[PDB]
Amino acid sequence: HHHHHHMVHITLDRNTANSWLIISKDRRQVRMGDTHQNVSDNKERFSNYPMVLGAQRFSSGKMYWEVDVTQKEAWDLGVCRDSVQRKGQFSLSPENGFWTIWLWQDSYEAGTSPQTTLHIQVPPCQIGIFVDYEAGVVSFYNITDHGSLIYTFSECVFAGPLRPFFNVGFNYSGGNAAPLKLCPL
Numbered sequence: 172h173h174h175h176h177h178m179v180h181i182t183l184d185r186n187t188a189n190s191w192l193i194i195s196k197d198r199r200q201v202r203m204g205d206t207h208q209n210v211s212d213n214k215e216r217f218s219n220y221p222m223v224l225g226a227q228r229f230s231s232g233k234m235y236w237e238v239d240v241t242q243k244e245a246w247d248l249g250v251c252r253d254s255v256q257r258k259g260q261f262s263l264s265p266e267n268g269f270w271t272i273w274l275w276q277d278s279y280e281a282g283t284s285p286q287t288t289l290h291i292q293v294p295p296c297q298i299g300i301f302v303d304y305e306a307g308v309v310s311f312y313n314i315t316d317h318g319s320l321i322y323t324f325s326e327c328v329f330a331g332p333l334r335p336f337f338n339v340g341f342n343y344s345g346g347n348a349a350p351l352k353l354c355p356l
């Protein structure tokens with residue numbers, strides 16, 4: 172792809188994080204902690220899942236960023252509406268304000284309703300995310316495989332400002348402790 176020139180510097184918003192997440196000093200990395208991380212609760216925090224938002228809000232233009240997923244067993248990545256539900260159980264779908272892909276149990280799926288099987292020959296270590304607000308597009312690229320296309324959501328109805336979206340996953344197995352990292356420009 173040729174989207175690299177729309178690169179944006181994303182940082183994580185601590186206030187939105189599940190209370191078990193550890194966000195680095197530079198706000199560019201996040202991982203699951205092994206306990207509650209000693210923060211106060213607030214209405215922004217994702218309660219049920221190890222999720223966090225980027226600080227940046229997008230309402231126009233073209234944006235691109237990259238995330239390192241090396242050696243993780245499970246994660247979700249993409250964008251979401253600023254007003255998505257934070258508390259309780261919910262599915263990742265465009266109807267609920269999410270445009271995402273994930274890894275779970277050795278398969279990659281797009282967060283459509285119902286979910287769509289992805290066809291990835293080279294397991295990615297870094298993912299590129301492209302948003303074209305005006306066109307209503309969210310695309311995902313396999314940086315490990317020369318930028319090959321993973322998935323495009325088109326005809327998106329964003330219906331609000333967008334925020335970068337992250338889920339480090341569940342780490343019941345002891346094999347999913349590694350961080351998500353925002354990769355440098």
Ligand SMILES: Cc1cccc(C(=O)N2CCC(C(N)=O)CC2)c1
Nearest residue numbers: 189191203219220221340341342343
């Ligand atoms: C619902 C939810 C929210 C946040 C984190 C998790 C999670 O993956 N673990 C890893 C395993 C750990 C444990 N077994 O003590 C409990 C936290 C689950």
